[PDB]
């Protein structure tokens, strides 16, 4: 079932989060930390944010899934993600 889905996604390299929702999220979060000022992201830097966010989330879910196989689970509960951040610090 899922096994044809993993081995297709660990082969390709393209982005998974779509570009426009991530751009709207970045323009939302950026305007709170600059005292209500807009900015103008270059069209290259949003790719850098998105690549760092994808790499961080993929490494995070790999470590969380390494935690899930320890306790006999296969399912990835929210107890698992909030514990793989306090260990890493």
């Amino acid at each position: 079932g899922w096994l044809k889905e993993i081995r297709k996604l660990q082969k390709s390299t393209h982005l998974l989060i779509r570009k426009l929702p991530f751009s709207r999220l970045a323009r939302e979060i950026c305007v709170k930390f600059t005292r209500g000022v807009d900015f103008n992201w270059q069209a290259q830097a949003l790719l850098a944010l998105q690549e760092a966010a994808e790499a961080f989330l993929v490494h995070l879910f790999e470590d969380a899934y390494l935690l899930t196989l320890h306790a006999g689970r296969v399912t990835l509960f929210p107890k698992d993600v909030q514990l793989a951040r306090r260990i890493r610090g």
Partner: protein, 79 residues
């Protein structure tokens, strides 16, 4: 109007399949939407500072590369 639900219910599923997780639970969809948000603050607040210093309203790629280098997670591919 939702503003964080642009991260969808299966985009988290695609990231978990790339990570290699067989079966996601439920409230993960409400958990990851927290964590990502926190991480973006500790880039963007760290990247809006450098572009504030050089009198530029444009947030270039080098600024995000420098902020990610300062956080510890070095990014190469852009510049």
């Amino acid at each position: 109007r939702d503003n964080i639900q642009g991260i969808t219910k299966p985009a988290i599923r695609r990231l978990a399949r790339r990570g290699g997780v067989k079966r996601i639970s439920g409230l993960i969809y409400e958990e990851t939407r927290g964590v990502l948000k926190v991480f973006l603050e500790n880039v963007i607040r760290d990247a809006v500072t450098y572009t504030e210093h050089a009198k530029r309203k444009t947030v270039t790629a080098m600024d995000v590369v420098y902020a990610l280098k300062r956080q510890g997670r070095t990014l190469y591919g852009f510049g």
